[PDB]
Amino acid sequence: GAMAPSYRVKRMDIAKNDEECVVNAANPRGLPGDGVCKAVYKKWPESFKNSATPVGTAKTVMCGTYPVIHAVGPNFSNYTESEGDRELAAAYREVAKEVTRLGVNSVAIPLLSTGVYSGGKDRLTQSLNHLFTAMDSTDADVVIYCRDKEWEKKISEAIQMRT
């Protein structure tokens, strides 16, 4: 575990993270994809061997000894708000199980279903609150990666609010 488990946020490419493992915002088919998924494919392509997994699940594949946790959030273009919300919460609970199983002291994590799977809606708060529900009982240092300047400020504020 980390000596004083924390949450932090950085605005940069998650492929340049400084943590002991990475969560990919994966598609269900283990394809290179776009956005976070394509950056992860360029950095850790060996981790996409048999990475296909259903919506609401996470599957870990090692790149050397570096763990890539493929977490499949719902595409809100296809899911109802209700069913999508349930699957998004479930994907983060499966990330918390994998992080715990791996015995890492730190994890780099993107906000699932906030990009091309958002169905054109701002899901910062929805996705971050599901991340917190899952990860609060883990003792890993969590570092959230984003690309937008206004998102960095809002994520930082939400972390600081809980103290």
Q: By the criterion CB under 5 A, which residues form the site for Cl ion?
A: 12-13, 115, 117, 146-148, 151
Determine the Cα angle at 57 with ends 120 and 114, to 5°.
Answer: 20
The nearest distance, CB 133 to Cl ion, in angstroms, is 19
The nearest distance, CB 33 to Cl ion, in angstroms, is 9
Nearest residue (CB) to Cl ion, 72 versus 107: 72
Report how far residue 64's alpha carbon sits from residue 74's, in angstroms, rounded to the nearest whole number: 29
The nearest distance, CB 1 to Cl ion, in angstroms, is 28
Residue 35 labelled as part of a binding site: yes
Residue 13 labelled as part of a binding site: yes
CB count within 10 Å of CB 1 equals 12
Structure tokens given for 107? 């994890």
Structure tokens given for 21? 């493992």
Annotated binding site for ADP-D-ribose: 13, 27, 35, 115-117
